[PDB]
Amino acid sequence: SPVDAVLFVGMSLVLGIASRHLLRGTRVPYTVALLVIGIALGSLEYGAKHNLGKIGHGIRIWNEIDPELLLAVFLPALLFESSFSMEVHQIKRCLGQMVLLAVPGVLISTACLGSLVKVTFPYEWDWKTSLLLGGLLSATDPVAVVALLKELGASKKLSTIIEGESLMNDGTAIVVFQLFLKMAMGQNSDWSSIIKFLLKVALGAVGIGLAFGIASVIWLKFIFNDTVIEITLTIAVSYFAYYTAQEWAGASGVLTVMTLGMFYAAFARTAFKGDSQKSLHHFWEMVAYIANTLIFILSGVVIAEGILDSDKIAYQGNSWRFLFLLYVYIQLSRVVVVGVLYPLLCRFGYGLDWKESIILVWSGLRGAVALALSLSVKQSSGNSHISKETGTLFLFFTGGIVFLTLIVNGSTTQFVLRLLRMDILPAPKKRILEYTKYEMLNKALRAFQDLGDDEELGPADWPTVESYISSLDPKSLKDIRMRFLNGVQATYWEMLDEGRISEVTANILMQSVDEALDQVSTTLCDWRGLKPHVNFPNYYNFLHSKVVPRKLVTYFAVERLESACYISAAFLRAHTIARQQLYDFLGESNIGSIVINESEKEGEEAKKFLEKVRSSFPQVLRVVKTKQVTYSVLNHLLGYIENLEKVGLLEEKEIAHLHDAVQTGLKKLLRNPPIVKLPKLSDMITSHPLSVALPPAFCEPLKHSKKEPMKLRGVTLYKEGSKPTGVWLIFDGIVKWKSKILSNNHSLHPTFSHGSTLGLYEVLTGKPYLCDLITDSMVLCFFIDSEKILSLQSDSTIDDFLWQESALVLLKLLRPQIFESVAMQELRALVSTESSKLTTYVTGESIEIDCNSIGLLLEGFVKPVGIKEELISSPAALSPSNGQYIVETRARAIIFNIHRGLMSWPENILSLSERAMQLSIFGSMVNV
Amino acid sequence: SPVDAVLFVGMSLVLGIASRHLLRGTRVPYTVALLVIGIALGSLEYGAKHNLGKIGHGIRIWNEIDPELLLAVFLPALLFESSFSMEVHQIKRCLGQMVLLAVPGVLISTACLGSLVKVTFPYEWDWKTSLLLGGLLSATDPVAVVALLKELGASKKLSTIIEGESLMNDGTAIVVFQLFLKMAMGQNSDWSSIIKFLLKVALGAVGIGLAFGIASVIWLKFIFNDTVIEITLTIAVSYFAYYTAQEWAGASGVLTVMTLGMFYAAFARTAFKGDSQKSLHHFWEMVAYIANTLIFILSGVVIAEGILDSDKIAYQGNSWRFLFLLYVYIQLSRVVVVGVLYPLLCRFGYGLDWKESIILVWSGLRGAVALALSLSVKQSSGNSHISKETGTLFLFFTGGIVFLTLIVNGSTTQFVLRLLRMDILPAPKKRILEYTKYEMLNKALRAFQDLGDDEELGPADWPTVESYISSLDPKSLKDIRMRFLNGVQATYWEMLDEGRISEVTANILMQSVDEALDQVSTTLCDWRGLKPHVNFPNYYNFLHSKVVPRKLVTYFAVERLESACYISAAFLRAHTIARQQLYDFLGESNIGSIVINESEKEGEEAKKFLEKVRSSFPQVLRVVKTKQVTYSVLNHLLGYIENLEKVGLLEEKEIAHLHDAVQTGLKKLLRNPPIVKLPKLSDMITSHPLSVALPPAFCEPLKHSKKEPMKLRGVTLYKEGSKPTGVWLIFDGIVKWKSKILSNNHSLHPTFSHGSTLGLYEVLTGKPYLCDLITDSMVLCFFIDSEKILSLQSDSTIDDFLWQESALVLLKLLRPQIFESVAMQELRALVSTESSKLTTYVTGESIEIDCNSIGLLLEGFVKPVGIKEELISSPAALSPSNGQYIVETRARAIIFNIHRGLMSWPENILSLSERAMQLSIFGSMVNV
Ligand SMILES: CCCCCCCCCCCCCCCC
Ligand SMILES: CCCCCCCCCCCCCCCC
Ligand SMILES: CCCCCCCCCCCCCCCC
Ligand SMILES: CCCCCCCCCCCCCCCC
């Protein structure tokens, strides 16, 4: 007999799947179909009293459910996914509005609804019962609202506001529901008892949720490679926190589960495995789906049971009159709440104008949370406090309100949104969507070439493949700003793809750019959306508060400045890249220079933050950079291991060992910031590329002590035109170079960084300093005298290397139009290639610059052919004029063999053998 | 009060997580800890009668579980993942052994155990009760055995055998358990009733499972983009099939759920979404985990309850004596089963030698299925048929046997496997593992370069990244065969990565190569493992049986020859590629030629199968190739959309629309083979690259009728030395070319394919046919006369194109050392480039062949410089001798600007500026 509850669950799930599948893209939630199906089924079982056989047995078994078991099983299932899929950064952006719409919004709605259904309803209810109903059906469902917002097409700001207030209204409304339910149960008669009950049920529930979250997050941090226990841990901790709060501490288990889910959303994005995230979210979304379906069908069944009893509440008239009165009361209470909070709602978080206010009012969808609360009231009814007729009325009214709100609100808020002209996609977003569709076309055609060379199967059919994918200026400052922001977006996309930034950092940066794309008429506001995430509050860790460890200080600083450092570095890198790209796309136009200077002025707060990090905490950026690099490394290893697993190339014991090793490395990363040894001067010397030339005897004068490598920002390294007093080794930081003498035209990013030595050209030649260096950051720089460098010129193997270093520096100096937007590791690869040749040239010879190569004069004089006799100075960067140069004096030279379309998309995009190629690859012809 | 069952579930889950986490890499299943914990907890609640408070309330609630509700909730949860994660191709490889170990193996074990516990046990049991116990504890658990095999390290053959027999022993043993349980309930007294009960409970259960599988698979095929209802559909169909079989049809719900899971494993790999697969498998594995944990803890609790009752079965002595007797009876019965079936087990499927037989005997792990069956017997005990003492004895004995088997078998089968020397990894697999680790090192270092250029954060710390990844001839015919098979493996990996083959096809091919890597001493046996998957049984569809539709015939042929065509084409392509690669790695050694000829002889059955497909069903390969190409295209689009979703670049409504479109395209693909229009002669002409030269007036002589494009294999197209009677257009198929006159040295793959026209050089010049063409397949070839081609020489825009086509053909003819292993679409790109120049050269001029380019003489004579005067013929392929050529007569020439390390891994793998580069990127220095 009890096995028929399994049948009830199975048939309810099948009906839920059928309703969800049939009512997709219909404006009509499948939940109204579930409620109607449950009501009809309960009418068959109870009103008409037909023989449903084993169907009716399960129906009756589930109708005899315990109220408190009902809540304990279903409410965590409903609410955990809503609270856990919460995205933390949009919530921190609109949290003032969230709490405003949650706590006082629910309080005002409860007051209005309770007063109205007290004064008007004919059931001679109490104030306790009236306010219990008011606070019951004051909880906007997060599942229904999220499902509505998926297909609604509203803006991200309004979608975030509505979703967050919907998921917090549940907590507040269930708190007040428990308060007034205990009141109706003859408790909480005094104000002091009210305060104690609220204090316990709210704060203790939040504390239990936080404690369980902390314990489970630490446990997850110590669970390395197991994606099954990571999800069953969420199940166990959720259903154990609910029990510990409701039964053991007497708190609110719902608030405990919601705080647990929010703690998981905040501090457990790195506690779970990366590939365990999708499975865990899918499982909890499915559990919410199953709980919602079961609650809707059970609520329908029990409504049919209760309103077709001896009393026949369904044939009383007053039931329906006051059901529609209750619906208009819902609408008026939501209007009152939004209007009262509007003067404060429009000033906090995201701006709320009158258009978003109408959608906020109209998206008052009631769902399975209110249904579950009223069902628990109905199932516990029949005693002296809440009569059976009253509990049946509560369930009937709540079910009718859920039905009416869904039908008249989910189906009509799309109309209200298309009206008021809030569904229109703005021009930058339309351009971006067209670019993405164009790139998808390019990917499809490229995949079609890559598989067109098959002799066994033959040729494919392009028309069929197309059928399956058949659903895919320089003077205006506004458009140039829009192109620049598109370039910044493209650079963020590129660095996310290459692994330089994580998905959360990428989302934050992309959201900032999307915000900035609406103010392209005014100055670039790209950093405005990043300012909330980049803050440096205080550094009291150096006031002896935590200098005794000196060891936890790095931990708190890194955990406290990790995401901000990533955001600042990514912002600066993307702005530099997009600035260079906009210079290449526009060339020399004054509007391009205006936007370039705008970006340079805007990128000052990020540099100031990075300076604060460098000064206050000199070791944090090393740890942060190391963590980023090894995180990307381990993700690349994970991708490789996933490909190995798919192909089945390795033994399942060896590939499992590799997977365990990489996943353990990732968990140990995201558990604890890397313990990076702070480099002294000795190991910074030995890690500099100049150290191969410097002998170990010169490397150990007390490990080159007595000099602090730190140089403050704005400190000149050496003045231009000065004598070669020495060279500078850049172990870290940024140095700017200025030179009016040098042909520094259009040097957009004059900069040298770590692993660079500056001044070798001058000390090796004796010529005055070619450029003016000033430190642009906290530079870890060491000075070695020219005597030490010049004394190294004994051997010819070291002279070659020193002149190649000089070649590097002058390549980034003499020719910055090509070699400034390249790393000085790629440039070292270019110079260090065996094909590159350093040559001392006797007077009267010729230098062989040619096609597909470049050369740079080091020391000497050269005169060309076919042009008026010119005495070219020693630094020349000798480039092919024709795509010549008799050696004049004793010469030195070395010859080297030397998503990005979003900025310039609809600009950067025949023969009788080109048409044949299209025929040979494709079917007839396609405009590739 | 009933809310305490939620507490029981939560604490049981927490204890299960703790046991699984603590006992990882311990040889000890966490399930023994679960059983011990449950026994101790039940002892506290029932024996010692301590006040456990709300813990004991949940304990007692779950102790009062219904037996049949217990089975209905837990057995589908346990067994669905085991039956659904079943891999179909290894099962079809060893199915004879599977059924042999499942049906008669379980029958023999049941007979032995029942007879032994009837004759020896002191409880005066019946034959019905004795055989009920024997068939209860005759079900080897699939969950425990799978978990053991994950860490065991046994071969794939033995692992597959053990896993499959374990997951089918459950079906057979639960069938016999239901039979003998109904017998003990006073039923099935006659042989005819026995036959009817077996017929119903087995065949009707299989039929219900098949029907539910068919319905749900069609439903899934019509569910496009919803990964949540796709998993809750599995839940609903599983728990509805169980109910429909057990309660409505009276069949076995367990057999129904297992056949449903096997149907999902077989015919629903394409019914679910690709990205829904991992989430669905994770969910069902977690459900099996939760059910197993709950069953073990509940079984412990109820054992403690039953053996500490008034009877005190735990203090009787006989309980323990016959528990250990029952364990030795388990061991002897398994020995008897394996020994009796060995003469047949060693001849069917995978060979079973005496070493794998010992592991087969010893891996007799009993688990949660036997525990659940005995718990259902215990919970239903207390009546006249099965006494309370008997049911308690059943549960106690089954729990003790599960405990003893786990402790003494899971912990010691690793020892038994390391003994007998079955844990040693063979040399080819060790080499492959070392190659994978080397490639992971290369990936890690490359990811370290790609993020070393950061001016804001600074430099990373390579030692830390390394710390996080610190766990990573030409004369022997055997080694050359091993290298060739490694090259075939690498090519399979490459085509899986590029999307030419799916993951199932890749797994089949890789398994075939792994099998072949053990017989490298003998001839290449790569095709031996593919022969089971490549069969062409019959084609009665053309005997008027189904020619009336002519429309379903393609559907059945494609669904029936899809995977076989993929396997054959991939095998032939990979063998051609690896043959060319082995020629490049070895050069000219006779051993390399021996292996090359071995591969060519081996690749004949695949070509014969493709010929059978081409002859019998001329339209199937077009459909199959189109489906493959569009599947890869849609997967690439999915990857692009996933990257778009991660970055948050598009609106969540537009990106959702793109995702829905691509996923709908994929579901419509895997639902129905593409409807590819069979090309007539007219559209094949218009789709050939020669059709741009051919005017529409020449294209429509009744759409060029009266000629059938089909040419049988072995039909010569034109003989060498013959007059240019015409040219041939290759729309499909393969043509081989032979020419002793031409310098065809080391032409390893002489072949032209679709989109190629052959003979233009001869008709344009009048020279005799340079090579001998014979059709190597069913070629769709058209003949156009030389008069039509020569009459096209009026314009100079068409002459250029015709001579460029001739250049293509002669590039693949004159110079096959470079241009035969390239598509004739890439070669068309090379020739059609604006940098390529066709030139008519007046007598006495010079031709400018240079570096980084190639040239080919078309028509005329040429004499070189510095070598004895040579009169080079018209086809020359004029290549730079120095890295010259005075035009002799009226000349024609055109000048063109012209995982793979697995085969040659530990063979294909400083300066003072190279050491500095390592310093500038890394920390000190790493051997890159
Ligand atoms: C006493 C009346 C019946 C009470 C039923 C208890 C609630 C059980 C709900 C189980 C839902 C299972 C589906 C979960 C799939 C992820
Ligand atoms: C007397 C009836 C007892 C019922 C006990 C049910 C315990 C289930 C707790 C965990 C359920 C989690 C999944 C819920 C999905 C809707
Ligand atoms: C009447 C005694 C208690 C019977 C309990 C019914 C079985 C409910 C099992 C629910 C398990 C929920 C966990 C599923 C999570 C995926
Ligand atoms: C009187 C007690 C009724 C209990 C009904 C439980 C129904 C649950 C059916 C579906 C359970 C699926 C998940 C099981 C995971 C172990």
Numbering used by the authors:
A (entry chain A), B (entry chain B): 32 to 503, 524 to 934, 958 to 972, 1007 to 1017, 1030 to 1048
Give sentences copied directly from the paper behind this entry.
Salt-overly-sensitive 1 (SOS1) is a unique electroneutral Na+/H+ antiporter at the plasma membrane of higher plants and plays a central role in resisting salt stress. SOS1, which is highly conserved in the phylae of the plant kingdom, is identified as the only Na+/H+ transporter that localizes at the plasma membrane and specifically exports Na+ by utilizing the electrochemical proton gradient generated by H+-ATPase6,7. SOS1 forms a homodimer and is composed of a TMD and an intracellular domain. Previous studies have shown that the C-terminus of SOS1 contains an autoinhibitory domain to keep the transporter in a resting state with basal activity.
